[PDB]
Amino acid sequence: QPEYFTKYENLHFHRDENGILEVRMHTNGSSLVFTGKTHREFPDAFYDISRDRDNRVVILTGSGDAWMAEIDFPSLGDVTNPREWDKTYWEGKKVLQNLLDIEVPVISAVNGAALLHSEYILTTDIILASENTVFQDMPHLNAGIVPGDGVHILWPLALGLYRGRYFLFTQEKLTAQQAYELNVVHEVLPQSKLMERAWEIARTLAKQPTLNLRYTRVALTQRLKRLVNEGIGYGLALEGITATDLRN
Amino acid sequence: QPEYFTKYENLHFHRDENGILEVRMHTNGSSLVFTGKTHREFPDAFYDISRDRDNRVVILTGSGDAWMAEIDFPSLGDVTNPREWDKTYWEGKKVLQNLLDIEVPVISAVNGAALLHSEYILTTDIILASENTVFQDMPHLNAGIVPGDGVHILWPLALGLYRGRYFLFTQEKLTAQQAYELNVVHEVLPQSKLMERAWEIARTLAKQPTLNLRYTRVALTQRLKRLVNEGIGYGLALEGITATDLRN
Amino acid sequence: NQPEYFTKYENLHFHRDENGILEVRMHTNGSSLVFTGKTHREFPDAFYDISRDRDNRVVILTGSGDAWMAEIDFPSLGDVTNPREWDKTYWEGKKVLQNLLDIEVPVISAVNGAALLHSEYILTTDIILASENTVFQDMPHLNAGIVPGDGVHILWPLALGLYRGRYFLFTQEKLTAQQAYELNVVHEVLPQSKLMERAWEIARTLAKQPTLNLRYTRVALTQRLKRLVNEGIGYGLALEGITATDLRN
Amino acid sequence: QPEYFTKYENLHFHRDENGILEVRMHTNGSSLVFTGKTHREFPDAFYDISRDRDNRVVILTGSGDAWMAEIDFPSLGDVTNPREWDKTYWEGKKVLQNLLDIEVPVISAVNGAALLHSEYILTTDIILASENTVFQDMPHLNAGIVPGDGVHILWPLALGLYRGRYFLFTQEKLTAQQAYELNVVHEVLPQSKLMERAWEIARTLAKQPTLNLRYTRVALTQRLKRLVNEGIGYGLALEGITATDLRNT
Amino acid sequence: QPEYFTKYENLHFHRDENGILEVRMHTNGSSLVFTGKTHREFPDAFYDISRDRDNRVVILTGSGDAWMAEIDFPSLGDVTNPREWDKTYWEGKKVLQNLLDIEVPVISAVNGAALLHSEYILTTDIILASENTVFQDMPHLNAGIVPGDGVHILWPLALGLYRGRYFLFTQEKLTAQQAYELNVVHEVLPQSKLMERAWEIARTLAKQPTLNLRYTRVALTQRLKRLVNEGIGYGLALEGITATDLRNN
Amino acid sequence: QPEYFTKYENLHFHRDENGILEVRMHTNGSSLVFTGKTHREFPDAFYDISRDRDNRVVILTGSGDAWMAEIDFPSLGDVTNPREWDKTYWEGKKVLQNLLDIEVPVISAVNGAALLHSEYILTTDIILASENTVFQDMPHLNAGIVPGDGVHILWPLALGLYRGRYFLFTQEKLTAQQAYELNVVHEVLPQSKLMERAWEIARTLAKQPTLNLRYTRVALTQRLKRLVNEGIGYGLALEGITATDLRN
């Protein structure tokens, strides 16, 4: 297996003979605790995934009963210092750019609560969720800083520019069933069946010729990439200013 | 209180100690009758609201049991003369530019029928409607002129580019419940409870730091502003030509 | 008393009333359309001809029999694996959507049954009515192993959003008429026997508008749509062409 | 030879064995007098050129000592009537769309004064001008109507958004030499040598593979097409309102 | 005289019977010293100009021997506090939006050094400069903050995306003659002849019908407005972060 | 020094105490011969430069008397096979994205002929050229494939959409003085003075605060990045089809 499969302490990699790669986020085998380390390393991981032509379909998932519900806030660095925030800003632009530049279909298997960094899910092509899943933008309006890391672009795409703004301004929580009705989640599965269904869909896709998988992903992500590129830097800059203001 | 609070005969202003500003449209205390005067003055009122940093959350509403269901068509001026339409054209560009440029969250409390100028509602972040509310683009195809004052952009944004065109071309009426299922309306309230709920949401928002309220509004309106800019002048110029054509 | 182009296209029947309402019906020898290289080449010219004729005041686009478009003659498209032949399909694929969008009056789709290919045509139109037997799918691309790059890649994610739209295309999902109605793609669901009369009823109400209002309302309501199609159509069809070449491998 | 070679009373066509097509605008073999007829027909001619895959390089030129310096104003129809202007508007959008959608390199051989419709030249890839050539947007501000037919987009694209606005607002005239210094004209030739040089450049281009000629044209016009599409309708609608306003005062 | 003509202590207004309005920036009769006050008031002045339909052509100029060469930096407020910078940010978006939304042709008469806020000039249609004029983006790299107030968009639009970046990054100074060769300045005049020439060009323009003046300005600013919209907020936010960072220099 | 300084056999790196990084392209110490290897590795090198916050100003240059005048065309692989061209396509997208995402000012010191890959230069902020320099798009029309690797966007951006198309379609050569008059080259220097002047400009820049350097680069590249994104993939796909056609 490629060297990058063991380069990331918070990502487990497993790939089959069909080139189906499962990337699973974890903290010591448990549900991911998001950290400054993952904020820095995940952009490199997604770049590494995107470079490797042997990846023909990607499944992105978490561990345990949450997709991402925990954060080690201090580990992010002093966000109120613009010279530190700049690292977050640069990494925040790269993570979405590098995710979107994965050049094959990407299946999200959302294995439970997704209360931060749900923008990752909203780069993917097929979204499956376990019945216990809840979606929220929790951290931004908790901290008093702009939801400017891509949720501001992708949630109003997903829900429209009316419900999307309501969702973000009120920190609305959506159940898996609500997100399914809203066309964000495409299938709701029992916890015990989610991963098998992800792999089933992946095996069906993997029967396609490789260039077809790659160029269908390209065709279907052009508009998405343009919309992310329009707003991501500005959102993260605004967010930085609001983080600085926490010292006032 | 600022001078502009008493500058507009068709707008009542009330602001609390948290910077929550309720702007209520009225004609001598009744539901608004839209006029050439409001078409001319509203862009200035929205500019004034946007300039005043003491406004931290804005609630925009009407009076009585309709949000806007009446128009004084002669008071608009001779729309069939391009020299008079040009006033309407310039003001139609400015009203939406200035309304979008309010730099804090805007809550619509839609207190009944919104049969004209519903595009104002479609600039706002949180949309609440009383159970008696109905939405329609009434006047344009009644008059034989283009629905080109922003409804052509914002209704297809709200409903998508399929149902939105059907809605405009057939002058479809949507109930509050239909609009809620279409994600345009976020909460449906009894008439007697609507304003209380608007203020409840506003007070929660107002606990955010001021720069976060402002910059979250900025981040969440970038794409919306671009889309309105793209089409508003062209729509109003085409509408003017069809107004001239009423002479033929 | 009728334009020459009304009888120029062996796969399109034309009928226009005194109000300028033109019904354009796709067919193969009076049956449901079998899409061919011929229709791929000719339909862009037909749509241009429709758009040029100012006597068209509202257009109804429909199929024949119990399917809107559910059949294709693959060989008749030409040797798609040769880029010199695909380039014909490419140029015609750009023109067909540009020309269809540039029809300058409201267009009503009366979807009279299965739409399993070329549903992007429907997704240029303003009012979408479907008979209750209608199903929507992007059938042929992932069956052949080539990119869904002829406009479905732009318009289905526009219609369903960029999440369900991608699921729909990558899994070749089938949507029923009720599903599409709940998804805001179909605006009315009708029994088969009532579909065309409803299309004509809506058209007659529209045709009471002044002519410039019909034209300029269509223009105002299609600006953003035209920009979105122009952004992605050539790129999708070029990528599709490369996957067609790759079929030789 | 294709039928369309003899379809246009104001365009002479000839094509060599290399697929190099020269399209020459004329009025009875003399310099073109622009008319309502050319405004209506030129969009169809440019479409016809673009459809024909045997065209591998195009040279667009005029006749005699002017590229286009005359117009028959009455023949344009009653521009002050929005129902008549709408024809000009629709044709004004189509002519640039269809000209840009010629899918091979286009060489302008500007054979003298270009005082109206110079936007056609600003769709082309290689611009050659005779020493006698002058460029101007003459007619719009002489008539009191908006320069909204594409010159408002393409002249500021050619001269930048500063000199381009100065040029339009003041009806500036540029000699061939000035236009060369401004990078609009690429070579200035003696009158008697212009056409030979156009053909020389065309023959060098024609040695390229056909798909390379077509796809290089596509790659090099994507941005240009987006910019034209952004402003052409709006410009023409504003121009129409100013034409209506000529009935006022 | 409208009330707004005497509302702004740093702008003198004079309008003739043809609706030609000259707006002259000054500080108590001398060349303008830019302040927090002008930063806050100028967006309202430009809005007021744009609202008043009696303005048919506008001439924007400075006083004395400089267009704008001085700034009272302390009067800008504590730029290092994001709560204070936010006023500058909001006003910095409004000033260019409101200036571009003047709906008639705008002539710049650049009467000498333009070392700050030259982006105002780069919204205008016709740029005239006295022989003594120099252009520079002086203050941003002298302070150590981003040139994010519109110069980052408009200088690369004027000079192109290569020379425009060199000009900003190296704080290049351009003479009037250099700017003329670069197509930014359209006419270079002796100091004593500058204003007469601005008025001559304005009187010629004022002979046009009013709607033509307005809609030609609209047609010629659509792309310009989109480009400024794209980048102005982001530039000013970035500039704000670097202003906060001045505490750490 | 960072590990990446010695990771690229065709790039020499030197960085001073002010964070001025000189990146010099070479083949065994001589002028660069462009290869499939550099096509693959340069995107990673430019990513590595962009990630390293100790880089405060970058100077990009070549070796010897040419910036890039030679290409090992066969080392690019079988460009006529779409499965091999896809590597070139993916890498062609990444190299410009990654070069543009260098987040500090980039000075080109063009040390001679730039007959291929001159689009790299057209991402940079300050362009200095030795007097022997000539610019041309040599390889595309020599091979009969589309100039679709970014030159199709950036040369018309530099020279305008008229001269730019002339330049590409006729394989025009521009000398350093011609490029200077066309505003592409900003200073023309004798060969022996070129690098000293690059470093002089760099040292003046490096006195700025770091965030100002970074965010001035960001502000000045937003439009440029959007224009590259618009057309880079389409150009490389069209180029690929023309490469396949070389078999016909």
PDB file of N, CA, C and O in Angstrom, chain E residues 187-210:
ATOM      1  N   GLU E 187      -5.913  62.577 -22.511  1.00  0.00           N
ATOM      2  CA  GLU E 187      -5.340  63.831 -23.034  1.00  0.00           C
ATOM      3  C   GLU E 187      -4.512  64.440 -21.924  1.00  0.00           C
ATOM      4  O   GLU E 187      -4.954  64.464 -20.775  1.00  0.00           O
ATOM      5  N   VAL E 188      -3.329  64.947 -22.296  1.00  0.00           N
ATOM      6  CA  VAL E 188      -2.465  65.652 -21.367  1.00  0.00           C
ATOM      7  C   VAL E 188      -2.510  67.133 -21.724  1.00  0.00           C
ATOM      8  O   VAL E 188      -2.315  67.499 -22.897  1.00  0.00           O
ATOM      9  N   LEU E 189      -2.796  67.969 -20.730  1.00  0.00           N
ATOM     10  CA  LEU E 189      -2.997  69.388 -20.985  1.00  0.00           C
ATOM     11  C   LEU E 189      -2.097  70.236 -20.091  1.00  0.00           C
ATOM     12  O   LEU E 189      -1.791  69.859 -18.974  1.00  0.00           O
ATOM     13  N   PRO E 190      -1.744  71.446 -20.551  1.00  0.00           N
ATOM     14  CA  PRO E 190      -1.134  72.375 -19.593  1.00  0.00           C
ATOM     15  C   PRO E 190      -2.073  72.629 -18.425  1.00  0.00           C
ATOM     16  O   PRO E 190      -3.298  72.642 -18.615  1.00  0.00           O
ATOM     17  N   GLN E 191      -1.516  72.882 -17.247  1.00  0.00           N
ATOM     18  CA  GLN E 191      -2.340  73.153 -16.082  1.00  0.00           C
ATOM     19  C   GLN E 191      -3.414  74.200 -16.359  1.00  0.00           C
ATOM     20  O   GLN E 191      -4.561  74.043 -15.948  1.00  0.00           O
ATOM     21  N   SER E 192      -3.040  75.266 -17.066  1.00  0.00           N
ATOM     22  CA  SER E 192      -3.969  76.376 -17.269  1.00  0.00           C
ATOM     23  C   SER E 192      -5.084  76.080 -18.268  1.00  0.00           C
ATOM     24  O   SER E 192      -6.016  76.871 -18.387  1.00  0.00           O
ATOM     25  N   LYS E 193      -4.978  74.949 -18.970  1.00  0.00           N
ATOM     26  CA  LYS E 193      -5.930  74.607 -20.038  1.00  0.00           C
ATOM     27  C   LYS E 193      -6.811  73.399 -19.682  1.00  0.00           C
ATOM     28  O   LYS E 193      -7.785  73.119 -20.385  1.00  0.00           O
ATOM     29  N   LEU E 194      -6.498  72.756 -18.564  1.00  0.00           N
ATOM     30  CA  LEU E 194      -7.147  71.489 -18.192  1.00  0.00           C
ATOM     31  C   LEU E 194      -8.653  71.637 -18.033  1.00  0.00           C
ATOM     32  O   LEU E 194      -9.435  70.886 -18.636  1.00  0.00           O
ATOM     33  N   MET E 195      -9.080  72.582 -17.197  1.00  0.00           N
ATOM     34  CA  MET E 195     -10.503  72.702 -16.911  1.00  0.00           C
ATOM     35  C   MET E 195     -11.326  73.153 -18.110  1.00  0.00           C
ATOM     36  O   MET E 195     -12.447  72.702 -18.305  1.00  0.00           O
ATOM     37  N   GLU E 196     -10.762  74.065 -18.906  1.00  0.00           N
ATOM     38  CA  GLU E 196     -11.453  74.493 -20.114  1.00  0.00           C
ATOM     39  C   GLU E 196     -11.716  73.288 -21.016  1.00  0.00           C
ATOM     40  O   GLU E 196     -12.799  73.177 -21.592  1.00  0.00           O
ATOM     41  N   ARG E 197     -10.745  72.378 -21.107  1.00  0.00           N
ATOM     42  CA  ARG E 197     -10.896  71.216 -21.986  1.00  0.00           C
ATOM     43  C   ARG E 197     -11.928  70.241 -21.444  1.00  0.00           C
ATOM     44  O   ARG E 197     -12.736  69.714 -22.217  1.00  0.00           O
ATOM     45  N   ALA E 198     -11.927  70.029 -20.120  1.00  0.00           N
ATOM     46  CA  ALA E 198     -12.967  69.182 -19.507  1.00  0.00           C
ATOM     47  C   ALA E 198     -14.364  69.714 -19.811  1.00  0.00           C
ATOM     48  O   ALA E 198     -15.279  68.961 -20.173  1.00  0.00           O
ATOM     49  N   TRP E 199     -14.534  71.040 -19.669  1.00  0.00           N
ATOM     50  CA  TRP E 199     -15.809  71.652 -19.974  1.00  0.00           C
ATOM     51  C   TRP E 199     -16.174  71.590 -21.466  1.00  0.00           C
ATOM     52  O   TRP E 199     -17.359  71.426 -21.805  1.00  0.00           O
ATOM     53  N   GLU E 200     -15.181  71.712 -22.353  1.00  0.00           N
ATOM     54  CA  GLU E 200     -15.414  71.569 -23.795  1.00  0.00           C
ATOM     55  C   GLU E 200     -15.958  70.171 -24.131  1.00  0.00           C
ATOM     56  O   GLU E 200     -16.975  70.038 -24.820  1.00  0.00           O
ATOM     57  N   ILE E 201     -15.289  69.135 -23.609  1.00  0.00           N
ATOM     58  CA  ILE E 201     -15.750  67.756 -23.837  1.00  0.00           C
ATOM     59  C   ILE E 201     -17.152  67.564 -23.228  1.00  0.00           C
ATOM     60  O   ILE E 201     -18.044  66.971 -23.846  1.00  0.00           O
ATOM     61  N   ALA E 202     -17.373  68.105 -22.032  1.00  0.00           N
ATOM     62  CA  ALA E 202     -18.689  68.001 -21.401  1.00  0.00           C
ATOM     63  C   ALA E 202     -19.804  68.693 -22.186  1.00  0.00           C
ATOM     64  O   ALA E 202     -20.905  68.154 -22.275  1.00  0.00           O
ATOM     65  N   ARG E 203     -19.528  69.876 -22.752  1.00  0.00           N
ATOM     66  CA  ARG E 203     -20.562  70.569 -23.533  1.00  0.00           C
ATOM     67  C   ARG E 203     -20.928  69.777 -24.785  1.00  0.00           C
ATOM     68  O   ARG E 203     -22.108  69.751 -25.180  1.00  0.00           O
ATOM     69  N   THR E 204     -19.942  69.130 -25.396  1.00  0.00           N
ATOM     70  CA  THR E 204     -20.229  68.289 -26.541  1.00  0.00           C
ATOM     71  C   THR E 204     -21.113  67.114 -26.130  1.00  0.00           C
ATOM     72  O   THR E 204     -22.110  66.817 -26.760  1.00  0.00           O
ATOM     73  N   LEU E 205     -20.741  66.470 -25.031  1.00  0.00           N
ATOM     74  CA  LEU E 205     -21.565  65.374 -24.518  1.00  0.00           C
ATOM     75  C   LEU E 205     -22.983  65.817 -24.165  1.00  0.00           C
ATOM     76  O   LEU E 205     -23.953  65.103 -24.430  1.00  0.00           O
ATOM     77  N   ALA E 206     -23.110  67.018 -23.588  1.00  0.00           N
ATOM     78  CA  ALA E 206     -24.413  67.476 -23.081  1.00  0.00           C
ATOM     79  C   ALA E 206     -25.437  67.735 -24.192  1.00  0.00           C
ATOM     80  O   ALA E 206     -26.618  67.860 -23.901  1.00  0.00           O
ATOM     81  N   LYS E 207     -24.955  67.787 -25.438  1.00  0.00           N
ATOM     82  CA  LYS E 207     -25.859  67.902 -26.591  1.00  0.00           C
ATOM     83  C   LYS E 207     -26.634  66.618 -26.863  1.00  0.00           C
ATOM     84  O   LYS E 207     -27.638  66.620 -27.586  1.00  0.00           O
ATOM     85  N   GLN E 208     -26.169  65.506 -26.300  1.00  0.00           N
ATOM     86  CA  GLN E 208     -26.877  64.245 -26.470  1.00  0.00           C
ATOM     87  C   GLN E 208     -28.208  64.287 -25.728  1.00  0.00           C
ATOM     88  O   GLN E 208     -28.363  65.012 -24.725  1.00  0.00           O
ATOM     89  N   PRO E 209     -29.197  63.482 -26.175  1.00  0.00           N
ATOM     90  CA  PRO E 209     -30.395  63.309 -25.341  1.00  0.00           C
ATOM     91  C   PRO E 209     -30.032  62.756 -23.944  1.00  0.00           C
ATOM     92  O   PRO E 209     -29.090  61.968 -23.797  1.00  0.00           O
ATOM     93  N   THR E 210     -30.781  63.158 -22.939  1.00  0.00           N
ATOM     94  CA  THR E 210     -30.502  62.734 -21.570  1.00  0.00           C
ATOM     95  C   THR E 210     -30.491  61.213 -21.401  1.00  0.00           C
ATOM     96  O   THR E 210     -29.556  60.681 -20.776  1.00  0.00           O
TER      97      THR E 210
END
